[PDB]
Scaffold this active site. Sequence first.
Site, PDB file in Angstrom:
ATOM      1  N   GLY A 154     109.793 124.819  -4.534  1.00  0.00           N
ATOM      2  CA  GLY A 154     110.428 124.688  -5.833  1.00  0.00           C
ATOM      3  C   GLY A 154     111.946 124.753  -5.824  1.00  0.00           C
ATOM      4  N   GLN A 181     109.543 126.916 -20.158  1.00  0.00           N
ATOM      5  CA  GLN A 181     108.906 125.773 -20.792  1.00  0.00           C
ATOM      6  C   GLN A 181     109.920 124.884 -21.504  1.00  0.00           C
ATOM      7  OE1 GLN A 181     106.277 126.633 -24.059  1.00  0.00           O
ATOM      8  NE2 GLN A 181     105.080 124.760 -23.760  1.00  0.00           N
ATOM      9  N   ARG A 191     119.220 124.413   1.156  1.00  0.00           N
ATOM     10  CA  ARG A 191     118.028 124.075   0.386  1.00  0.00           C
ATOM     11  C   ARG A 191     118.043 122.603  -0.030  1.00  0.00           C
ATOM     12  NH1 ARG A 191     114.014 128.473  -0.489  1.00  0.00           N
ATOM     13  NH2 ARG A 191     115.215 130.414  -0.701  1.00  0.00           N
ATOM     14  N   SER A 251     114.896 122.408  -7.760  1.00  0.00           N
ATOM     15  CA  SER A 251     115.658 123.032  -8.835  1.00  0.00           C
ATOM     16  C   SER A 251     117.160 122.912  -8.623  1.00  0.00           C
ATOM     17  CB  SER A 251     115.279 124.506  -8.964  1.00  0.00           C
ATOM     18  OG  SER A 251     116.101 125.155  -9.918  1.00  0.00           O
ATOM     19  N   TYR A 268     116.306 138.569  -6.188  1.00  0.00           N
ATOM     20  CA  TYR A 268     117.353 138.871  -5.224  1.00  0.00           C
ATOM     21  C   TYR A 268     118.343 139.886  -5.781  1.00  0.00           C
ATOM     22  CZ  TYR A 268     115.715 134.662  -2.780  1.00  0.00           C
ATOM     23  OH  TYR A 268     114.950 133.733  -2.127  1.00  0.00           O
ATOM     24  N   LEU A 320     104.010 121.817  -9.545  1.00  0.00           N
ATOM     25  CA  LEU A 320     104.177 123.224  -9.194  1.00  0.00           C
ATOM     26  C   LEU A 320     104.693 124.049 -10.372  1.00  0.00           C
ATOM     27  CD1 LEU A 320     107.363 124.391  -8.608  1.00  0.00           C
ATOM     28  CD2 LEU A 320     107.214 122.620  -6.863  1.00  0.00           C
ATOM     29  N   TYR A 321     105.235 123.391 -11.393  1.00  0.00           N
ATOM     30  CA  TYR A 321     105.823 124.109 -12.521  1.00  0.00           C
ATOM     31  C   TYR A 321     104.833 124.361 -13.657  1.00  0.00           C
ATOM     32  CZ  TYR A 321     110.464 125.920 -13.290  1.00  0.00           C
ATOM     33  OH  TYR A 321     111.555 126.750 -13.371  1.00  0.00           O
ATOM     34  N   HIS A 364     111.120 121.092 -19.885  1.00  0.00           N
ATOM     35  CA  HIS A 364     110.510 120.000 -20.632  1.00  0.00           C
ATOM     36  C   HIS A 364     111.524 118.941 -21.048  1.00  0.00           C
ATOM     37  CE1 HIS A 364     106.629 121.722 -20.492  1.00  0.00           C
ATOM     38  NE2 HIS A 364     106.160 121.104 -21.561  1.00  0.00           N
ATOM     39  N   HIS A 389     101.126 128.233 -16.325  1.00  0.00           N
ATOM     40  CA  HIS A 389     100.386 128.665 -17.501  1.00  0.00           C
ATOM     41  C   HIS A 389      99.778 130.066 -17.367  1.00  0.00           C
ATOM     42  CE1 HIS A 389     100.433 124.199 -18.084  1.00  0.00           C
ATOM     43  NE2 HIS A 389     100.839 124.630 -19.265  1.00  0.00           N
TER      44      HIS A 389
HETATM   45  C1  COH Z   1     106.789 127.996 -17.608  1.00  0.00           C
HETATM   46  C2  COH Z   1     106.031 126.905 -17.740  1.00  0.00           C
HETATM   47  C3  COH Z   1     105.128 126.567 -18.955  1.00  0.00           C
HETATM   48  C4  COH Z   1     104.809 127.249 -20.072  1.00  0.00           C
HETATM   49  C5  COH Z   1     105.240 128.663 -20.533  1.00  0.00           C
HETATM   50  C6  COH Z   1     103.913 126.406 -20.854  1.00  0.00           C
HETATM   51  C7  COH Z   1     103.354 126.732 -22.074  1.00  0.00           C
HETATM   52  C8  COH Z   1     102.309 126.075 -22.707  1.00  0.00           C
HETATM   53  C9  COH Z   1     101.677 126.399 -23.985  1.00  0.00           C
HETATM   54  C10 COH Z   1     101.997 127.556 -24.972  1.00  0.00           C
HETATM   55  C11 COH Z   1     103.041 128.386 -24.843  1.00  0.00           C
HETATM   56  C12 COH Z   1     100.702 125.500 -24.197  1.00  0.00           C
HETATM   57  C13 COH Z   1      99.757 125.439 -25.418  1.00  0.00           C
HETATM   58  C14 COH Z   1     100.673 124.571 -23.087  1.00  0.00           C
HETATM   59  C15 COH Z   1      99.815 123.496 -22.931  1.00  0.00           C
HETATM   60  C16 COH Z   1     100.107 122.354 -22.214  1.00  0.00           C
HETATM   61  N1  COH Z   1     101.043 122.295 -21.201  1.00  0.00           N
HETATM   62 CO1  COH Z   1     102.305 123.810 -20.596  1.00  0.00          CO
HETATM   63  N2  COH Z   1     103.716 125.218 -20.183  1.00  0.00           N
HETATM   64  C17 COH Z   1     104.448 125.294 -19.021  1.00  0.00           C
HETATM   65  C18 COH Z   1     104.523 124.314 -18.069  1.00  0.00           C
HETATM   66  C19 COH Z   1     104.047 123.041 -18.221  1.00  0.00           C
HETATM   67  C20 COH Z   1     104.524 121.894 -17.496  1.00  0.00           C
HETATM   68  C21 COH Z   1     105.631 121.832 -16.424  1.00  0.00           C
HETATM   69  C22 COH Z   1     103.674 120.742 -18.020  1.00  0.00           C
HETATM   70  C23 COH Z   1     103.771 119.281 -17.603  1.00  0.00           C
HETATM   71  C24 COH Z   1     104.588 118.622 -18.703  1.00  0.00           C
HETATM   72  C25 COH Z   1     104.859 117.214 -18.288  1.00  0.00           C
HETATM   73  O1  COH Z   1     104.614 116.918 -17.095  1.00  0.00           O
HETATM   74  O2  COH Z   1     105.314 116.409 -19.137  1.00  0.00           O
HETATM   75  C26 COH Z   1     102.788 121.285 -19.006  1.00  0.00           C
HETATM   76  C27 COH Z   1     101.869 120.544 -19.711  1.00  0.00           C
HETATM   77  C28 COH Z   1     101.069 121.001 -20.727  1.00  0.00           C
HETATM   78  C29 COH Z   1     100.104 120.221 -21.470  1.00  0.00           C
HETATM   79  C30 COH Z   1      99.833 118.716 -21.241  1.00  0.00           C
HETATM   80  C31 COH Z   1      98.369 118.480 -20.872  1.00  0.00           C
HETATM   81  C32 COH Z   1      98.219 117.432 -19.793  1.00  0.00           C
HETATM   82  O3  COH Z   1      97.157 116.755 -19.771  1.00  0.00           O
HETATM   83  O4  COH Z   1      99.134 117.271 -18.942  1.00  0.00           O
HETATM   84  C33 COH Z   1      99.528 121.028 -22.368  1.00  0.00           C
HETATM   85  C34 COH Z   1      98.437 120.619 -23.379  1.00  0.00           C
HETATM   86  N3  COH Z   1     103.035 122.648 -19.094  1.00  0.00           N
HETATM   87  N4  COH Z   1     101.664 124.955 -22.201  1.00  0.00           N
HETATM   88  O1  FLF Z   2     114.686 127.448 -10.212  1.00  0.00           O
HETATM   89  C1  FLF Z   2     113.489 127.070 -10.275  1.00  0.00           C
HETATM   90  O2  FLF Z   2     113.116 126.349 -11.235  1.00  0.00           O
HETATM   91  C2  FLF Z   2     112.550 127.507  -9.172  1.00  0.00           C
HETATM   92  C3  FLF Z   2     111.311 126.975  -9.492  1.00  0.00           C
HETATM   93  C4  FLF Z   2     110.241 127.210  -8.650  1.00  0.00           C
HETATM   94  C5  FLF Z   2     110.410 127.964  -7.502  1.00  0.00           C
HETATM   95  C6  FLF Z   2     111.651 128.490  -7.185  1.00  0.00           C
HETATM   96  C7  FLF Z   2     112.728 128.261  -8.029  1.00  0.00           C
HETATM   97  N1  FLF Z   2     114.050 128.750  -7.808  1.00  0.00           N
HETATM   98  C8  FLF Z   2     114.451 129.688  -6.814  1.00  0.00           C
HETATM   99  C9  FLF Z   2     113.649 130.725  -6.357  1.00  0.00           C
HETATM  100  C10 FLF Z   2     114.130 131.596  -5.392  1.00  0.00           C
HETATM  101  C11 FLF Z   2     115.415 131.443  -4.891  1.00  0.00           C
HETATM  102  C12 FLF Z   2     116.219 130.412  -5.354  1.00  0.00           C
HETATM  103  C13 FLF Z   2     117.627 130.218  -4.831  1.00  0.00           C
HETATM  104  F1  FLF Z   2     118.147 131.405  -4.505  1.00  0.00           F
HETATM  105  F2  FLF Z   2     117.610 129.406  -3.766  1.00  0.00           F
HETATM  106  F3  FLF Z   2     118.391 129.672  -5.783  1.00  0.00           F
HETATM  107  C14 FLF Z   2     115.733 129.546  -6.313  1.00  0.00           C
END
Ligand code: COH
Ligand code: FLF
Lengths: 551, 551
Positions: free
Chosen positions: A494, A171, A88, A498, A323, A352-353, A175, A356
């Site tokens: 992804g 998140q 990978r 990672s 897995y 890709l991450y 971050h 939301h």
């Molecule tokens: C598992 C992934 C995940 C989760 C659970 C999550 C949970 C939440 C959450 C409440 C739980 C709120 C209110 C938001 C709201 C936001 N998120 Co996310 N975020 C997530 C992944 C991301 C990622 C990755 C970014 C980009 C951050 C950066 O690039 O700095 C992001 C960026 C943002 C932004 C920036 C806005 C912009 O213009 O880029 C806001 C607002 N958000 N998010």
């Molecule tokens: O680990 C992350 O953050 C991940 C994020 C996005 C997509 C895939 C991701 N990991 C992932 C998903 C499937 C299998 C494997 C591996 F087994 F290669 F580690 C790693």
Amino acid sequence: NPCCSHPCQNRGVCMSVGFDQYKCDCTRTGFYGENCSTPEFLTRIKLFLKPTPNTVHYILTHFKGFWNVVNNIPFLRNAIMSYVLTSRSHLIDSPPTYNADYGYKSWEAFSNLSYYTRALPPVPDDCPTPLGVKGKKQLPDSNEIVEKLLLRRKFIPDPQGSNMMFAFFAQHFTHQFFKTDHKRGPAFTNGLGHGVDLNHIYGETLARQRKLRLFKDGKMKYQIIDGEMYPPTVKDTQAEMIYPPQVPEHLRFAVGQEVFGLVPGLMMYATIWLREHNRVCDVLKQEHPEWGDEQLFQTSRLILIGETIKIVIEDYVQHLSGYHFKLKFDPELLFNKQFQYQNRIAAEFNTLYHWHPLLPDTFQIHDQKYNYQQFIYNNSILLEHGITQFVESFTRQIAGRVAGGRNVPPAVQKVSQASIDQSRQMKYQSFNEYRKRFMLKPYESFEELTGEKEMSAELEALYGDIDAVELYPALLVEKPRPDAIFGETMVEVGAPFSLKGLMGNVICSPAYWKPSTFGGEVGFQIINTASIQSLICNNVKGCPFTSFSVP
Amino acid sequence: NPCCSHPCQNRGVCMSVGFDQYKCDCTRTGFYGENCSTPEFLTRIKLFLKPTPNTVHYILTHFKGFWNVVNNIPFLRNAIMSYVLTSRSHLIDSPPTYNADYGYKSWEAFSNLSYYTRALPPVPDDCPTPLGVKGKKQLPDSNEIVEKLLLRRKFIPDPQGSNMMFAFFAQHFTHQFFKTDHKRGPAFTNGLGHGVDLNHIYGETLARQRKLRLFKDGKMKYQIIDGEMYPPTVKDTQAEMIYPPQVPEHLRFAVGQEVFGLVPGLMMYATIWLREHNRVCDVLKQEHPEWGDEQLFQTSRLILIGETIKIVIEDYVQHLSGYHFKLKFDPELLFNKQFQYQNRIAAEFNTLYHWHPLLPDTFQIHDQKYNYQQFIYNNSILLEHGITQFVESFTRQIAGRVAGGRNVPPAVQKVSQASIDQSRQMKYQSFNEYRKRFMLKPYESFEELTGEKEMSAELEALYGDIDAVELYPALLVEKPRPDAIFGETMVEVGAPFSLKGLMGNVICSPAYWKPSTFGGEVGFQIINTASIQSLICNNVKGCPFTSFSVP
Ligand code: COH
Ligand SMILES: O=C(O)c1ccccc1Nc1cccc(C(F)(F)F)c1
Ligand code: COH
Ligand SMILES: *[C@@H]1O[C@H](CO)[C@@H](O[C@@H]2O[C@H](CO)[C@@H](O[C@H]3O[C@H](CO)[C@@H](O)[C@H](O)[C@@H]3O)[C@H](O)[C@H]2NC(C)=O)[C@H](O)[C@H]1NC(C)=O
Ligand SMILES: *[C@@H]1O[C@H](CO)[C@@H](O[C@@H]2O[C@H](CO)[C@@H](O[C@H]3O[C@H](CO)[C@@H](O)[C@H](O)[C@@H]3O)[C@H](O)[C@H]2NC(C)=O)[C@H](O)[C@H]1NC(C)=O
Ligand SMILES: CCCCCCCCO[C@@H]1O[C@H](CO)[C@@H](O)[C@H](O)[C@H]1O
Ligand SMILES: O=C(O)c1ccccc1Nc1cccc(C(F)(F)F)c1
Ligand SMILES: *[C@@H]1O[C@H](CO)[C@@H](O)[C@H](O)[C@H]1NC(C)=O
Ligand SMILES: *[C@@H]1O[C@H](CO)[C@@H](O)[C@H](O)[C@H]1NC(C)=O
Ligand SMILES: [N+]
Ligand SMILES: [N+]
Ligand SMILES: [N+]
Ligand SMILES: [N+]
Ligand SMILES: [N+]
Ligand SMILES: [N+]
Ligand SMILES: [N+]
Ligand SMILES: [N+]
Ligand SMILES: [N+]
């Protein structure tokens, strides 16, 4: 610009020669020809023996009894895990190459750490279409894409059973290396460590770290509220945070990452990791009564970095992959292998991450519900219920499915739209270009992509050409794997980013991966026995059961 | 501190356990036991079979007829060069470990790029003697050492025949990564690229690069004086330089490195390399009439980086080594090997490169003699004679012998004292410790060190214990190899730092090392055919013959 069409295949480097001609550099691509299309003899063998990722995924997510035996045969498990890592990782260029401003290799792009790097170069400036030559002269309206394809109607839970412990861990953890500097633009980051340095605990700069530290026993400042350890306040640390003015001064918790006041879920993990730090300080003081504050702090940070990578691989990615094969964190797997112990965060990895769709319609703590208006920037909720109740609650609450489409809550609707707009600013190539970059077959139809009629129709009406579909939208509407949370492309794009960020950490290098680095065998064992359950068990009152999947 | 005595042998990591005990971490040292002094079986065999450095050096510097054959058998020559690169590189921890403030591995020491890294950790500040446990309670007066052991009485020429072209190339080249920030202290550097990025041409920061550029055809600013290209001035660029008040404005040349006005020999190479950048710009414009100023500048910089690595390996280190075997710059030698494409400048690399004994008592340009007072900060000398004249004169003028003692010019006497003093601020371990670090047998007597009776008696009177002799003094008084410029320790300690900085450059990595990176085959071929003679021939009027040794 002749390279606008992205002529060169199989990682060939497209270079303009004269105003109307191009050249492809097929060096070490395994191909030759004008467009690096003709496979060499060896490439031809490899390509024939190589299974499709869908095959590999089937095999890995089936035959449970077999994997349970393989997992207990160290020679086999190690050999497999070792292959996962090396194979990978070969997909990521390291040292890094392109960024938003450079579709050709340059020293500015290599050396400037303020940029996110790029896996595919930006579409050149003077092109027939935004994506090069495919698609219309103007991409579809982003808000229309959101409403038609991404906006949630009815909540679609995750078939793999991902919970809120998983969503907020995702998140919180990412971050630390997704920290785009928006005063500058989406192409830039404030996370100059470009990986897992735990700056979201300790602060990005030494100046911030000094404000958060206690300078006694290696510990980090904290409060005791209701008999439990919490983060310190902005007033007590002078460490700036982002809080709306509504927030009273005593609820303004100060942690490494400026933005972790946004949701209590983030502050829950900041609190848990803060406790872990001071716990490891206590452990190390026992092992080293002769140690000073500085060495206790530094050694605890290195141990916590180890715990993080350990937990991320063996619990978080483990859950996420589905897995039956038990993934392993073991830097020794790579010592006899070619591997670069460095990393640079890719903008596409950031794009890709944006998971939301994970987020629920309401947040359910104990016997209460909270909408987004009530939940965001409300640490009162955190003090009211306590961490234990938070873990109990988040463990039981199901998260949403990320692939499949139409599952972004309206509350974060504008965030999804921002993700599309920002990728256009940075001139991302098309979804199919990114498929090819990570050795996937490009989709030939909107239907093949979604495996479905409605959205695929909406998509064709928006884009027209399948080669015009953008990276972010396609990932969320892609056909999920069977009962999976993700489609094929999310995983295959992804996972390389990672693993490279995880194993490319300096502590995984042979000079570092010794017990003496972490204070002896005791400190070293904290890393190698760490789990999400043990993180909760040692630092959360009552030692509640937890897991990244719903019971 | 029980680690003050440096108990752990063979790279074992020392760690305190309680107040009065230590533990040696023998992991992957090839040894075991309380002090990692017992060899394992494979270690026993390797040690028994491995020839000494002085034996290897003898063999490489004799049997020319044999080496002429070897040189013309590519399969063989490549294998040898490949072995030279990997075996020496193993002696450097990459990613880096210690710095001046951390005798244990920590995230601060790894992540903070403002530090010089450290091959050996600093002596703890609470030890019975300043070097640990050996030697007197106070170290000798640094002025005494300089006067008794290092100061020049009569010039001693380099038996290898190094000239002033060599001496100023050494100074010019290394001062792109030896750039210590005295505002902060000797432990800190302003060269955050930590290697060969040619910041001493283009400037460290983007802001400075922008002042020096012309933003036409990718070129750098310049002046035309008496028919030839010269660097621009402080006034025209606004790029600050170091100059005493005496220097008139119009003679305050502005180049990448702020201190290259110090001496005309540096300003010569700055001029030559400036001409080379603009020459390569002309070449590339012809290849790519469609390219803008930005890509022409960036691609030119990447080409010149390659030229630098090319010349340093195959002309500079070649001459330096004294070998009949012909060194090769070929990134391909490492593509099947384990190798980290990154580097961090070691403070010790800086200390050992203080080759001020190279310097003459007077500088001879054409038919004129210049002492230091009239040669220093005098750019009119450069305009007076021009570059062609400078090359011809410097190619003829012999440089001094670095090792062997008492060959430091009185002019730079205080610089040599600053080198000892700064070593002590940074808590360097002893000469013998650094010899063990690089797999050399420690010296048992001062007589063994100098190979003589006089200097070794001053040494003994100053230090008392051979294990108390400091790194920098010992490097310069050490017995030289037969008719060589250096002794064993300079070569064996320096060579690994050097090769790691050269091959660890990003352009030597497989993703970068390909024609398209340099604008095609024409550009790629400028690197691979570059030499110190061609550099001069392409950019110096008359194309005077040059070499790093006197005819
Ligand atoms: C598992 C992934 C995940 C989760 C659970 C999550 C949970 C939440 C959450 C409440 C739980 C709120 C209110 C938001 C709201 C936001 N998120 Co996310 N975020 C997530 C992944 C991301 C990622 C990755 C970014 C980009 C951050 C950066 O690039 O700095 C992001 C960026 C943002 C932004 C920036 C806005 C912009 O213009 O880029 C806001 C607002 N958000 N998010
Ligand atoms: O680990 C992350 O953050 C991940 C994020 C996005 C997509 C895939 C991701 N990991 C992932 C998903 C499937 C299998 C494997 C591996 F087994 F290669 F580690 C790693
Ligand atoms: C390798 C060959 C070499 C040569 C030929 C050379 C030639 C000359 C030269 C006239 C030709 C003069 C006037 C000087 C004078 C100086 N040199 Co050198 N230096 C050389 C290698 C170095 C190195 C390496 C340093 C340390 C640089 C740094 O930034 O610490 C240095 C540092 C210095 C300093 C700063 C000392 C301090 O404050 O720490 C002065 C002054 N000098 N040197
Ligand atoms: C790399 O290490 C450097 C050395 O430790 C470090 O520089 C130091 O930074 C601190 C604060 O950032 C400076 O001290 C400050 O102390 C008081 C706190 O009471 C402040 O109010 C002052 O304004 C002052 O700035 C040190 O003076 C400084 N030391 C040196 C030698 O420069 C760097 O910050 C580290 N680099 C990174 C990226 O963290
Ligand atoms: C990494 O790349 C960054 C983007 O190119 C770069 O930031 C840019 O820096 C320049 C100069 O440092 C800024 O331009 C300056 O121009 C005039 C002065 O002539 C002022 O009026 C401006 O306000 C500004 O100071 C750019 O504005 C700036 N761009 C961004 C987006 O921030 C970094 O400097 C690069 N990093 C390194 C280490 O070189
Ligand atoms: C907080 C997550 C850290 C991972 C450590 C998990 C084990 C927590 O418990 C620890 O188990 C050790 C045995 O491994 C014991 O030696 C320790 O005494 C005990 O504190
Ligand atoms: O390359 C430098 O700048 C160097 C500096 C100090 C000491 C030795 C140095 N190089 C060196 C000296 C001898 C042999 C070799 C090698 F052959 F390994 F390349 C390299
Ligand atoms: C924040 O949470 C508390 C309960 O802990 C609640 O009373 C309050 O109304 C919430 N704030 C908002 C704006 O909803
Ligand atoms: C500088 O060099 C010139 C020779 O071109 C000479 O005339 C002048 O005296 C020199 N300056 C000093 C201060 O010696
Ligand atoms: N590429
Ligand atoms: N072939
Ligand atoms: N701060
Ligand atoms: N809401
Ligand atoms: N499904
Ligand atoms: N070490
Ligand atoms: N500057
Ligand atoms: N002089
Ligand atoms: N000699």
